[PDB]
Write a protein that binds this DNA or RNA. Sequence first.
RNA 1: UGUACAU
Length: 341
Amino acid sequence: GRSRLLEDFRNNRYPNLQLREIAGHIMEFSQDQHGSRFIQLKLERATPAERQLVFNEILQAAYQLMVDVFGNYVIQKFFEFGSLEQKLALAERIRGHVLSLALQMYGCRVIQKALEFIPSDQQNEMVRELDGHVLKCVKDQNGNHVVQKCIECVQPQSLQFIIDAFKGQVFALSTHPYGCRVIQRILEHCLPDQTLPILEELHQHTEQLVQDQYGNYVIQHVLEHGRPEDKSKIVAEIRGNVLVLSQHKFASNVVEKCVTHASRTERAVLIDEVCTMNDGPHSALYTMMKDQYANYVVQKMIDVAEPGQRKIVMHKIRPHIATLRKYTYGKHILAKLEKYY
RNA sequence: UGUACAU
């Protein structure tokens, strides 16, 4: 049901098509793959009057265009380049529909863009609509990116309804594919009194989390961007378990970020842990230097260890070379010790 | 030689 105008334009029949030569058709073009691209382009170089021409027609049809696979890009354009009046006018069209848009495949894309370009007042009005549906949104493949975007953009003081919805759902959520992403945002952007309760739960479950395909990513975040005190609780939980955890697909990564991001003393106490303590009938370092994952840990110890501790490790390894040569994951550990002596 | 985000 494409107008002859759209058809002809979609078939190279208007190399000089001007913005004003499509008035009456602004929706039609917005829902087309080429039409939508055309509009967006001419819109950058557009005059104030031209841009109003187009706004008149997209405002009229705003919600439809928001949940459209092409229309949404046209709308996002106005949040970026439109005037303050055009932005507030679009955000007003959204009022009432924040949640259904956030769960919508294309709608969430608009929300994310609106959140990034409307004034705090309108941001705060928009976010309020999510209260009551915080976990529905987070566990959703679209919503989760809105929530993520809320945390990045809105005053933290406005996001307490979220922190309150995470109470008792920190672990369950850090083991969620989307949940874990949102936990990271919160840790990055939220206020001290908000991150406290999150970190409380995080610590109570550090053991389970470090071995979880998503959880482990959250612990790594804390070891990379977190407060020293928090780091130490994590490493206090890795300390002693260094051998077992380094042989794990997921947790082996945590152990590297402990070796890497702990204090100078803690770092030295973790490296010594594998050099001393032994494994059943074999030595710890021995087991690790040939394991498919743990071998990476070893190399990461060789790195962050100050020359003193690094000589003892090189020395501790030197005897097992021939065994190392026989195992495939011992190759890159060999590479390192070979460059040494 | 080893793990996660959508038009």
